[PDB]
DNA sequence: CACTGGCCGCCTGGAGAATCCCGGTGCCGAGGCCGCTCAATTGGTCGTAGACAGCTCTAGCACCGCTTAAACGCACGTACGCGCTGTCCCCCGCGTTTTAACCGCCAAGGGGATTACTCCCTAGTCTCCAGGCACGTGTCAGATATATACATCCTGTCATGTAAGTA
DNA sequence: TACTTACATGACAGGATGTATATATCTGACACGTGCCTGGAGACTAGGGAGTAATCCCCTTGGCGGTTAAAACGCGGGGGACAGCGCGTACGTGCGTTTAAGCGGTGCTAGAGCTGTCTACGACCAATTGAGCGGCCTCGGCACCGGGATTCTCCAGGCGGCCAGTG
């Protein structure tokens, strides 16, 4: 039930493929740690917003509606999920 | 006893709704009142933008040798127009990926 | 000798294939479990539709990938082909956090 | 017994058939189009509301939304949307 | 006389005299305070309107407002704002 | 026989108006109806932010041995505080200038 | 009546003073014309918005209120002239 | 021999001086001439409030000092201290425009 | 091999100026007073939106069982960053000369702004009907799978520049 | 000294595989048909927002004379930029293994969401008043002015260490 350390579940080759989509030539071995940290910070902000949205609506399930609202708040509005 | 019902979009000669967009403005709380020509203008603007992006999507689908538009074709349509990137630079796309863009030193030799 | 390419040619193929690609780059199940891991820290017993996991996922490659084009701009500015962490926090700080 | 969901489905399908008769449309692309129409509509409506607030105008007019088209839409898209809107309100007024 | 151009003069001056009885205020700083109050009020009001639109709510009470505080103001300022806002609303219900 | 007109800000124990904030919310067209807790809560958060920033401004002014606050002191007050800097990242103070923040590599040795 | 060259009216030592406020120590010789050009671009973007506000207001005289509104539209909100 | 300060020492004194300072770094009347010129490009016979010229002055100085901070970061990124057009274009490209 | 004088790096002391520290003066900016006004407040009343209860049904949670793709880890290998240093060059510091910016002083009128008027318009509501949405299905573009062709990338092999022996 | 000849490096050729190029298959998501209703719409009405005439004044625009700091130009110089060589280095990629995500399957219920009640609650309007802003005046904190110190900066030649001559 309770989890500790699943941030390693975003694997190193997942970060490699992400950077390949971004057009990266060479990814240093140091890079994966702060990419995980930046993803930690960004998802923390987004789900903090989304949890605040859901707790405003007095629900217990995070919907994609509140997700795209949280992305619209941050100036990263996403197309394709019913916003 | 009553005039025949005629849609206001067909009165303006548009496909995009005068009525639905007008109602959504009235319930969207942007003002207390809205002028009559404002939803017609807004529907015309939305129809122009959608017509441009769907024309570019059909061009991309013909380039991709496909008949039905995919959000990859839509991302290819947006990012290959500079002024839409001036409109939609900060908006992220579902399943669109990235425009093909390999920089000059990134290419070999 | 067995077949083996020079360094970066396979990276060229990877970049070309994955910019042509539209399918998902990160695994689904550990991403959903990571969202759950972060969520229990903020509110316990929190559930997600699959579509909300999809939307957070699309936002994740969106934000990350955009940071990598910023990182490539920084890296080619420093006359290098290998990226360094300072490229990432430099791009983040110029971006305005 | 379900609840009706409002979308732009047949409208986008109509204009797509007008600009390209032989093409199709996917459901993911329709989600993209619904999000696009909603977002651009919201941007124009919000800036029109701000224009009405700044000039103490309590109503939304075609003139100020034309101002919003000048503001938001850059370059040739602005003047083409102006031509489209003026033509549209012209044949709407004549009707 | 001329028309009243409404401002946040005496309120900022009183909160200064509470927090620092001896120090003064310049007019440029005073305009900075007016634009500060306007900007923060606009941000909170816009996010409250957005939250009302999302939940299909015609009502803005303190609950949406503290939601918008927890969005916009980061962390320590947000929880402190909840603290004095909670004190204010409890004193308001107790009149 | 009407009761004495006593003020809502004093009912909150606050100085920022419930009245002006409530009026600007109603005429700002943000919702159809507005709960009574919303403008008093908003006055409370504005008063806390105002008290915090004029606290830092007064401390900076006494640091520069001056009695009257100036937007130089305000701008100094804003970017010593990290969460205020996060709040006001995109905002420019008029006549505020920039707080001294020199990168160490360009400093002499 | 007509003005053709006032972009050179933003003089090079004045650009130097601005860069001193930005913490710049060493400024290349090609920088000044580029700064003139990008300042020209930013003034173009601001003044098209401000004149659009003005012609909506049916005014001929540009006001600082429209300056504040055009700056806050671009995400560059300026304190000190509102109200 | 007349006294002469080393190159950069007066530059650091300029940085400390103008960084401590709050006053305007552009002459107000050529800026007014320039803004009337660019205004006449879009609408003829335009008139400016003096406060409007000052507000555009503060906004222009603000955008320029922010971009100059960004180019300072880009220059110290590139193992250099002299800012270059490539640094300025790096800043403009990263900032999303 | 030690002493010691000389030479060179370098390290310290000292000297001049630029802003700071300390007085000296005059001034209009803001803080307070006065007057006005308009706008918050109180009570009542009337309508109305969301909290709460209840039900239900559906997709998310939970558990189960195969399958190699992903992951990972090591190993060879090649390219990658970068420091030294040289080399070349380009812009800061300062002095001098010009010039228009700033001040400051005065005339004039364009339009920002305000008030009134009167009429254009626009939400609201009752009602009517008609096109998009829920729902159902059937059907061909695409997902998938199998057989070729070139790209292309790396690697071998002769072609050729070139250096050395010697007539 | 030029001619001949052997060697090392580059231009030319060729194979292998992976991704493109061609074609057969099935299948479900796209696309078409149907019932519906609710949401768009026509007419009338109540009412009120804004376009426009008039004006005024004030605040912006235009013009004129001087100072001197701002700007501009030149000399000099020191700092910066950057590329070649080398040097050590660190991921990229190939390939075998694991395992755990991925794909298909099943059961239950949390809670998401719709529906009925009702009530807390909020909005609107006449009166009223009281705090909050327009306008003015005062003095003293601060802008402007003047003189010496400390600090900053930069330079010479005093100091120490090292080296080589000499006894």
Author numbering:
A (entry chain L), G (entry chain P): 20 to 102
B (entry chain Q), F (entry chain M): 10 to 118
C (entry chain K), H (entry chain O): 37 to 133
D (entry chain R), E (entry chain N): 30 to 124
What does the paper say about this structure?
Here, we report cryo-EM structures of human H1-containing tetranucleosome arrays with four physiologically relevant NRLs. The structures show a zig-zag arrangement of nucleosomes, with nucleosomes 1 and 3 forming a stack. H1 binding to stacked nucleosomes depends on the NRL, whereas H1 always binds to the non-stacked nucleosomes 2 and 4. H1 contacts DNA with L1, the amino-terminal part of α2 together with L3, and α3 to stabilize the nucleosome and contribute to chromatin compaction.
In contrast, the presence of H1 on the stacked nucleosomes 1 and 3 differs between the four arrays. H1 is absent from the stacked nucleosomes of the 4×177 array, but is present on nucleosome 1 in the 4×187 and 4×197 arrays, and is present on both stacked nucleosomes in the 4×207 array. Particularly high Δβ values are found for entry DNA at nucleosome 3, except for the 4×207 array, which is the only array where H1 is observed on nucleosome 3. However, when Δβ was higher, H1 was not bound, likely because a stabilizing contact between loop L1 and linker DNA could not be formed.
